[PDB]
Amino acid sequence: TQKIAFSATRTINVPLRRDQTIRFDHVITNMNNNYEPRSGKFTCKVPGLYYFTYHASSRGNLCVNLMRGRERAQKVVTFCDYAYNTFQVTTGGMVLKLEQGENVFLQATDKNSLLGMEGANSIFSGFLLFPD
Amino acid sequence: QPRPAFSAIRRNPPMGGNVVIFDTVITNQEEPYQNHSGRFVCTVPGYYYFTFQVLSQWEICLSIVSSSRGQVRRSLGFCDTTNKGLFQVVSGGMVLQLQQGDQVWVEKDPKKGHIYQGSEADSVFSGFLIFPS
Amino acid sequence: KFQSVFTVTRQTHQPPAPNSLIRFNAVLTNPQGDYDTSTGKFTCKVPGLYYFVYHASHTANLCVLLYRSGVKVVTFCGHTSKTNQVNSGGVLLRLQVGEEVWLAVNDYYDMVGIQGSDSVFSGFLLFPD
Ligand SMILES: [Ca+2]
């Protein structure tokens, strides 16, 4: 009976480098423990259809890659949302079919304005839709 | 078991009309979504969640629209009118209770319909069954 | 014995009061009545894992705060001047019977969308427990 869902926020106050995995260090929810707050990666143990989503607060240009894959990650999509001298909240989502061992995570780019703090949170969530 | 669920993105979208067509499929379990029309077709009756995150640089206003027996049902819309030529993501979403044959798609405002075309970043339309009946 | 789902909208051209609970007065779907358009609150009937998500349109500054049983869980802010944008946020929560969930604004409270841009709050039970 596969109840898998995670929600983690980023409270890490340190700039991101291009190609770096975006870690969401603070776990709100982690049923089945398939999300690793240490890395910021979800690892599939139960093959199936999942939905992933995120909302990112930002003070400038932000682009993130949604990554999938077992040992070598591959970008599925890139979401960009720009901001000039202002504050924003952006979002992206994807239903993915996952195989055992595959990880999904968010990866930074040169466009790296992302905030993680009380009152302007950045969150990464995912959950199983149908196993199989 | 029924496992209807899809995501599609824009890459080489046919352009014309006010239905926003997401031509590139990422996921389409049970194939409910048609990438040539931009339309999700309900097979399993029940409660579904649909969402979009679409990229613009100018003005965009989008609505998740449905049909039942071929009659269109207009619904809420979601806009970004920042209009400064920098990337902005307009999003929206809602649960829909659907019967067999009902269709669901995203439509743009004929007066506010700028959707980014290119390789830098993506726009996505997603949907899934929450529960049958 | 049950499921849980709602989508509610705010149908008014007047914004919420500053530092207040955001009331969604109109229902698109709410079969179990878990969202109460009178109080603006969702109350858990069937315990388990829920997703909550919203998309709110605004033409001045807006922060949305999601509360669970009296505790701020997440906040997300969008700043704009004159022109319209969407503030979105969401989270997954394992709730017990009787727990309340709701949205609020802070000193940034604008939810005045231009014609065609609405504000929506949805939630649904994913895994009964
Ligand atoms: Ca922006």
Swiss-Prot record, chain A:
Activity control, per UniProt: The C1Q subcomplex is inhibited by sulfated molecules, such as triterpenoid sulfates, heparan sulfate, or chondroitin sulfates.
Stretches assigned to the C1q domain: 1-132
Listed GO biological process terms: complement activation; complement activation, classical pathway; innate immune response; synapse pruning
Annotated Ca(2+) binding sites: 81-82, 88
Cystine connections: 63-80
Cellular localization per UniProt: Secreted; Cell surface
Main location: secreted
Coiled coil: none
Gene Ontology terms: cellular component: blood microparticle; collagen trimer; collagen-containing extracellular matrix; complement component C1 complex; complement component C1q complex; extracellular region; postsynapse; synapse
Record key words, sorted: Collagen, Complement pathway, Disease variant, Disulfide bond, Glycoprotein, Hydroxylation, Immunity, Innate immunity, Pyrrolidone carboxylic acid, Repeat, Secreted, Signal
Post-translational modification comment from the UniProt entry: Hydroxylated on lysine and proline residues. Hydroxylated lysine residues can be glycosylated. Human C1Q contains up to 68.3 hydroxylysine-galactosylglucose residues and up to 2.5 hydroxylysine-galactose per molecule. Total percentage hydroxylysine residues glycosylated is 86.4%.
SUBUNIT field: Core component of the complement C1 complex, a calcium-dependent complex composed of 1 molecule of the C1Q subcomplex, 2 molecules of C1R and 2 molecules of C1S. The C1Q subcomplex is composed 18 subunits: 3 chains of C1QA, C1QB, and C1QC trimerize to form 6 collagen-like triple helices connected to six globular ligand-recognition modules (C1q domain).
Domain observations: The C1q domain is the ligand-recognition domain, which specifically recognizes and binds the Fc regions of IgG or IgM immunoglobulins.
Protein name: Complement C1q subcomponent subunit B
Native species: Homo sapiens (Human)
From-to range in the entire protein, with total length: 119 to 250 of 253
Swiss-Prot record, chain B:
Sequence ranges assigned to domain C1q in this UniProt record: 1-133
Protein name in the entry: Complement C1q subcomponent subunit A
One term under GO cellular component: extracellular region
Annotated disulfide bonds: 61-79
Domain of life where this protein originates: Eukaryota
Molecular function in Gene Ontology: amyloid-beta binding
GO BP terms in the entry: astrocyte activation; cell-cell signaling; complement activation; complement activation, classical pathway; complement-mediated synapse pruning; innate immune response; microglial cell activation; neuron remodeling
Gene name of the encoded protein: C1QA
Self-association and partners: Core component of the complement C1 complex, a calcium-dependent complex composed of 1 molecule of the C1Q subcomplex, 2 molecules of C1R and 2 molecules of C1S. The C1Q subcomplex is composed 18 subunits: 3 chains of C1QA, C1QB, and C1QC trimerize to form 6 collagen-like triple helices connected to six globular ligand-recognition modules (C1q domain). Interacts with CR1 (via Sushi 24 and Sushi 25 domains). Interacts (via C-terminus) with CD33; this interaction activates CD33 inhibitory motifs.
Keywords (A to Z) from UniProt: Collagen, Complement pathway, Disulfide bond, Glycoprotein, Host-virus interaction, Hydroxylation, Immunity, Innate immunity, Repeat, Secreted, Signal
Residues bearing attached sugar chains per UniProt: 35
Portion of the full-length sequence here: 112 to 244 of 245
The organism of origin for this protein: Homo sapiens
Swiss-Prot record, chain C:
Keyword field contains Zinc: no
Biological process, per Gene Ontology: complement activation, classical pathway; immune response; innate immune response; negative regulation of granulocyte differentiation; negative regulation of macrophage differentiation; synapse pruning
Domain named C1q: residues: 1-129
Keywords noted in UniProt: Collagen, Complement pathway, Disease variant, Disulfide bond, Glycoprotein, Hydroxylation, Immunity, Innate immunity, Repeat, Secreted, Signal
Major site of localization recorded for this protein: secreted
Modification after translation: O-linked glycans consist of Glc-Gal disaccharides bound to the oxygen atom of post-translationally added hydroxyl groups.
Assigned GO CC terms: blood microparticle; collagen trimer; collagen-containing extracellular matrix; complement component C1 complex; complement component C1q complex; extracellular region; extracellular space; extrinsic component of postsynaptic membrane
UniProt key word Phosphoprotein: no
Compartments, as annotated in UniProt: Secreted; Cell surface
Regulation: The C1Q subcomplex is inhibited by sulfated molecules, such as triterpenoid sulfates, heparan sulfate, or chondroitin sulfates.
Record-annotated disulphide pairs: 63-77
Disease tied to this protein: C1q deficiency 3: An autosomal recessive disorder caused by impaired activation of the complement classical pathway. It generally leads to severe immune complex disease characterized by recurrent skin lesions, chronic infections, an increased risk of systemic lupus erythematosus, and glomerulonephritis.
Quaternary data: Core component of the complement C1 complex, a calcium-dependent complex composed of 1 molecule of the C1Q subcomplex, 2 molecules of C1R and 2 molecules of C1S. The C1Q subcomplex is composed 18 subunits: 3 chains of C1QA, C1QB, and C1QC trimerize to form 6 collagen-like triple helices connected to six globular ligand-recognition modules (C1q domain).
Domain free text: The C1q domain is the ligand-recognition domain, which specifically recognizes and binds the Fc regions of IgG or IgM immunoglobulins.
